[PDB]
């Protein structure tokens, strides 16, 4: 929504209101889930080949009481500059380069995008303090090939004992799993012109001393790689992705997997009158999980999804999503770690601007 | 304040800033009370008989320090469809239908509207997970008759060690009084054309397992009913309302009343040059309150209010409100529950958009 | 950024997104420091000599995880009237008159403004519940002489013991150091026309009963005064200020200074091509610090800064700020009171609107 355009500067507001209800036997997911997003995007024309921009995206939950706490948080906040064809650079809270692939399959009515991607988890998704350089023609060598170089500085929690550990942006009571040391990321994507497109991403970062000592994943670095393909043409949206992670992905209340194998696939069709059904599959196979002095292999995430979204227009929509969780509810591992096994049904009515 | 109207979407930002001070010997309310509201109203034209809309209202306190917590919370957040004459349906955090009457007498400069209305109190006021269907002229057959059908799903907090209690949207350390089970609400109003209007509304809801056991109110449902009349014409506003509530409305630090009888009346005139006096009286008589193993009938809220508002224009106003509290300060009952005994004088200067 | 101007009502949205990083050996400062500001400025024309205005400024941190608490708070929120040329009166959360001087030297790239200025510290900076009368001609006596009269109501924390102590707007565990009683403020400024301007301010405030009893600053009133001069012409910006405070300025984890001597200077040049280096010095000499049952004189704040801001245009800028800290590193006073001694280097890229 363009609301300002004077003196070579543009400011657009954007957000949504999601009237959302969950039907699920898991009493931690069942119930009202109404939330909203508010934010702005502005961009200023410095000169004919230079532009500056900043972006804010805020999440505000509306399903708890006005006395409830911590119902609002920021998803994105970054500033950046784009030098025409030479590329762009941004810094702040932005998406991890790994998400350059995961976005292709993070396109379900309500659920999805969570086989291995978590917020504040190295560069798996949205991260604090990422410097991201991107370019749309790979240094002019290949038109249509996107490239990304990304670097994320340390976000380490302090210790009440010695005051020389950590960074400002992690409280002492931080969950150690969502901390990280410094790290870089690489990603690139291509559209072949036939509606078939490919992308891949690679990141590698150090893990904080406290992660090496207090988590049940052993090792000094967190690494990830992903590739994906999508077919987006003739009213069809097909997107699949495979990924692997080492000493990075969390699971349960207090677990890190030394290794994961992850797969997602989403198959969708777009009817001309507004209905968009979608069939999807998501899996995360944990590996070498250190439980009680011994290793074991368990599915951390595994569910099939069927659902549809109906678009009245670009500004209003409603949808249903059915998450059929295939994790074994009779495997005590899940309850023990607090990983839910139950199903969810989502009902959503969404205004956008 | 309409800021967007392009390609079939309309978006208005709205809110106010209230520079507000309270003068009172009750030390938990005396002092600065400055707050502001920010939010939006969005409406999109799907086609000639269909409209989508979304609404956000934010409450942001600005009367405490930049270090304080929980100074901001969401008042309203819903998405909806209006199908011409067939009516409207929306879901999310919206007003309860009991407020179809209470809004008539909650028309004071600053105070008011608090005989039986509490936020997050089933559908007494604003509630989570309420679906509200409204029809504004009975399908175009009868002018001036609005009716509303409303449904509110269960809002209950967990149990510390039982995984069978609660909702996603209520934590265990929530006050159980502002919890609720499923329930429906009905409301209707009619304006006979002479500036007098009559309305009544009725709600009945289940009470949660925790509500029946941890509070001082017994019963398996929480229900309330109310009727009111308003005369709104020729710079005169008289509105009174009567209500009854059973096993729902809270009082004091940790109390819910088995029965309340509540009445409010407001007499206001609007002068041509901008002065709007307000004569109002508000009372809620509690019944069968369980204090220490014995029943009691005591006044929960009882005061007379006088005040005036001066409107500079549609965007600026200032006011003084005098709440003269009629509850007996020497009755040890009140301080025991933390129920106010003191008078309040409010002076506020309000910028609006 | 003007987004509304209809029927004598204007609404401007304003704020910035700062991609900010600090490099510092202090683990309470090192890391990502990315934040954003959001707010509006509204003005309506009541009539030919009357204007209403409201303003909100919000700070939102985006440097901690979506799980973090208290990443957002209000810096400013006030409503007011301007009687044309006769001056202005506004109330709410606004700046203390002392900052009418401090703002001149609080103009460094990143750092600065912290010799003695802290938020919610009587009228040193932003405060709750300030009523401010302003005049652009000193009651008609002297054209060009700005005058300010300001009154701040009691901001006193409640007591769990006596429930008639304190104000509504100070929470259970509130720090009494940032509390305050009643107090008045006076301020004035003049532009001599050759680029030299002078300003001075004086405030005196009562302190709360608990402030006299629970803090290491002895006395029953908190007082401060400041004067400063600036040269702002010929691409040179020179500003200095000297200030003194009594029983008001805080320091460290649990400290109040019985007296402070404060000096700031910032020297800046603005090149025509957009670079603006700035060299500055800031000191606050603490005096009569009752730290361990004994009085002491310590530098509370003392550092030099060198840095530059580069302005792409009115909407985008990037900068570097190098703060060289002069405090005595081998002094147990600092660690014992928790005042950091280390340097910080900041790198920032800023979008503004």
Author numbering:
A (entry chain C), B (entry chain B), C (entry chain A): 1 to 353
What text does the study give?
We solved the structure of OmpK37 by X-ray crystallography, providing a structural map at 2.6-Å resolution to better understand the relationship of OmpK37 and OmpK38 to the major porins. Like the other porins, OmpK37 assembles into a trimer, with each monomeric unit composed of 16 β-strands that cross the outer membrane to form a β-barrel. All sequence variation seen within and between OmpK36 and OmpK37 trimers maps to the extracellular loops of the β-barrels and residues lining the upper reaches of the pore. Analysis of the structure also illustrates an important feature of the β-barrel porins in terms of the solute channels that they form: no clear path can be seen through the pore, due to the channel being particularly constrained in the central region of the protein. This impediment is dominated by the inward folding of extracellular loop 3 into the β-barrel lumen, to form a “constriction zone”. In this loop 3, OmpK37 carries a bulky residue (Tyr118) not found in OmpK36, a residue that was previously speculated to lead to a decreased pore diameter. However, the crystal structure of OmpK37 dismisses this conjecture as the tyrosine side chain is oriented toward the pore exit such that it does not contribute to the constriction zone. All other residues of the constriction zone in OmpK37 (Arg37, Arg75, Arg126, Lys16, Asp106, and Glu110) are conserved and adopt the same conformation as in OmpK35 and OmpK36. PhoE porins have a constriction zone radius comparable to OmpK36, while OmpK37 is in between the OmpK35 and OmpK36 pores. Our results show a lower permeability to some antibiotics (ertapenem, cefotaxime, and ceftazidime), but the structure of OmpK37 reported here demonstrates that the pore diameters do not differ and could not determine drug specificity.
